[PDB]
């Protein structure tokens, strides 16, 4: 008789907050200290990278973890263990593709706050990870490689899970993302405070031996720097290890009058809260008494 709603879960909002902070934190410079008792003026700055983080309840509270096989994410849950913290999550900032995440226990699983509502995003959780390698231009044009027949394979597997969900008498098609912000249109993502943007046209044009995605690299570029340029260039950014595991997707479905048995899907769904959401779906915080 226990309720879970992954789509209204302040843990998501909360995590997002923290990630944001982690980012601002990573931009502010050190404030000079005062007093005769200061060891050094050198302050520690943690670089903007995926940090292992658990979320935890205070005393008098607790976290419920749903353990139902292929859990809906919303509604009742039967095998619900109660715990003090979540598993450790090393969250990755990205769009379109969920990276380095948890894999679906058995087979491909998809989730949406509603499926009839095409407005609501669909989160795909893969049961089998797909590798993807990306490199900083030796500083050789920034790009990413991917096992083709493996990816095509995945899309097919997904299509199936959608036919199941929308009546398998329908034809599934993937289109690239339409208009929007650059980050939303491309598959973008963090890599140590530098952000890749990747033309994923080749990733989302599927129907009825490796792939290469071209990428740009927007850099930090401020702030808090004006009238302060006396030193040299960056420290560890020659050929950054960005390669990772694709463990999910964010999708949205089209809704026009003239679409028949035929359904179109595209690459980027909602905001990044949805990323966190994909890891926190099986948890909930709640009070004791």
């Amino acid at each position, epitope marked *: 008789t226990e309720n879970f709603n992954m789509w209204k879960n302040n843990m998501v909002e909360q995590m997002h907050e923290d990630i944001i902070s982690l*980012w601002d934190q990573s931009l502010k410079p050190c404030v000079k200290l005062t007093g005769g008792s200061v060891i050094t003026q050198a302050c520690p700055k943690v670089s903007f990278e995926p940090i292992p983080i658990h979320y935890c309840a205070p005393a008098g509270f607790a976290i419920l973890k749903c353990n139902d096989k292929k859990f809906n994410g919303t509604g009742p849950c039967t095998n619900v263990s109660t715990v003090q913290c979540t598993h450790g999550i090393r969250p990755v900032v990205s769009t379109q593709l969920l990276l380095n995440g948890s894999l679906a226990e058995e087979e491909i699983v998809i989730r949406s706050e509603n499926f009839t509502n095409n407005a609501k995003t669909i989160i795909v959780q893969l049961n089998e990870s797909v590798v993807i390698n990306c490199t900083r231009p030796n500083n050789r044009q920034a790009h990413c490689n991917l096992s083709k027949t493996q990816w095509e394979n995945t899309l097919e597997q997904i299509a199936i899970k959608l036919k199941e969900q929308f009546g398998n008498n329908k034809t599934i098609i993937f289109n690239p993302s*339409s208009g929007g*912000d650059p980050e939303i249109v491309t598959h973008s993502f*963090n890599c140590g405070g530098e952000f890749f943007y990747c033309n994923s046209t080749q990733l989302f044009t599927w129907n009825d031996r490796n792939i290469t995605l071209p990428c740009r690299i927007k850099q930090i570029i*401020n*702030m808090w720097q004006e009238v302060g340029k006396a030193m040299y260039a960056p420290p560890i950014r020659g050929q950054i290890r960005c390669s990772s595991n694709i463990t999910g997707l964010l999708l*949205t479905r089209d*809704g026009g009058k003239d679409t028949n048995g035929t359904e179109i899907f595209r690459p980027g769904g*909602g*905001d990044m809260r949805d990323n966190w959401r994909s890891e926190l779906y099986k948890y909930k915080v709640v009070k004791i008494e």
Partner: antibody
Amino acid sequence: QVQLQESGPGLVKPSETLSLTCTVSGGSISSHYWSWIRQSPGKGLQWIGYIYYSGSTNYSPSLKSRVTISVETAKNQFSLKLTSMTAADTAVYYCARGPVPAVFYGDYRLDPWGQGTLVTVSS
Amino acid sequence: EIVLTQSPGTLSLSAGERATLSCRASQSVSSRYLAWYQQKPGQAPRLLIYGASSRATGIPDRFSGSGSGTDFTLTISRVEPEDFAVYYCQQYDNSVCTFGQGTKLEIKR
């Protein structure tokens, strides 16, 4: 490309309220922020407020009391509501995407705009 | 809340000349949040420069942005006949988005 299209009554009687609708095509309201801006004849630009596709809003302080911005992602449009219209409210009203970027590391700016609608307050 | 004051109310020159429009904030402002827009008569404004010095896509490179802190500058290297427009600097801070009152650019011929 992404195109916005306002629409609504050219004329509004004094004290009554204003309703407008911007319609997006080429892109999707999802993931994005959406603003209304107005400009009086010969005057300058005034930001009215925005709404996140999520539904959370943020209004300009000097207008807060009279403004409502709704969204209907299902039909891919957002709307304005302005209370107690007076001659001082006669203006061209624009919808525009932004000013906040979809993601935190995006860019801050108002883009694609609408064409604007001229609303006249008169009996 | 911040107040943006633009450079000259009206600015008038011939084609080929260089135009300098400034924007001065009542307070200090991060460059990420400053933008410029060009409004030709009868039209909606068009994004010209975002993030102080970043050129919007499609915009002719004879436009450039500069400055930081309190003083910012839009610069047109070689004025054209159809660069005739009103020009607004804008910023977003503290949950509020304000504009300068604009600079009317007139062409001499």
